[PDB]
Amino acid sequence: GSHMCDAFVGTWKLVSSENFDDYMKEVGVGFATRKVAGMAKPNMIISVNGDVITIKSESTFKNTEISFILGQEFDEVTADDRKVKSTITLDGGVLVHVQKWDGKSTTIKRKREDDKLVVECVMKGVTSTRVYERA
Ligand SMILES: O=S(=O)(Nc1cccc2nsnc12)c1cc(Cl)sc1Cl
């Protein structure tokens, strides 16, 4: 029957981005990767099988895939090749994804708003907003 993340499931295409270069700078991404990754128009493919959520992000730059159980820490290699420890939880209907590495932390929030999936990425004082629509 219906569950946790049903409204996230599907295939989503990036339609807008704001301040992603600044977010990537704050994270520590170098110039060439910022330029190529910032040009990308990834799709995001979200699926659920039991307790396991899978999020794939695919673009001309890279294809990434994470599978996880809410509240259970895992290893992630990010699109920019960081080796991070991640934990994803659901907080009042928002997927909250925290990445830890090198004594640093960033949080990515994914939420459904109208027909969009809105992604907010925060690294200290810098927020990037990325908006997806159904493919
Ligand atoms: O928007 S993303 O979800 N993923 C991607 C951004 C750009 C190019 C890509 N190719 S594959 N996945 C990609 C993203 C990557 C971070 Cl690093 S931070 C954060 Cl949000």
> Which residues precede chain breaks (C–N over 2.5 Å) in the chain?
none
User: In the CATH scheme, what is the homologous superfamily, with its name and number, of domain 6-131?
Assistant: Calycin beta-barrel core domain (2.40.128.20)
Task: Report the SS3 class of residue 36.
Answer: helix
DSSP for 92-130, please give it.
Answer: TTEEEEEEEETTEEEEEEEEEETTEEEEEEEETTEEEEE
Sketch the domain layout of the chain as residue ranges: 6-131
Contact 76, 60 (CB under 8 A): no
Q: Which atom of ligand 1 is nearest to the CA of 23?
A: 18
Kindly give the distance from the C-alpha atom of residue 1 to the centroid of ligand 1, in angstroms, as a whole number. Answer: 31
- Nearest C-alpha neighbor of 60 from the set 83, 37, 82: 37
Kindly give the distance from the C-alpha atom of residue 43 to the centroid of ligand 1, in angstroms, as a whole number. Answer: 9
Task: Report the SS3 class of residue 30.
Answer: coil
Question: What experimental approach yielded this model?
Answer: X-ray
Pocket of ligand 1 (CB under 6 A): 37, 40, 42, 57-59, 61-64, 78-80, 108, 119, 121, 130
To what resolution in angstroms was this structure determined? 1.1
Cα–Cα distance between 98 and 73 in angstroms, integer? 10
Q: Which residues pair with 57 in a beta bridge?
A: 44, 64
Query: For residue 13, what are the CA distances in angstroms to 8, 43, 96, 125, 127?
Result: 13, 4, 20, 27, 20
The answer to the question of whether 131 is labelled as a binding residue is yes
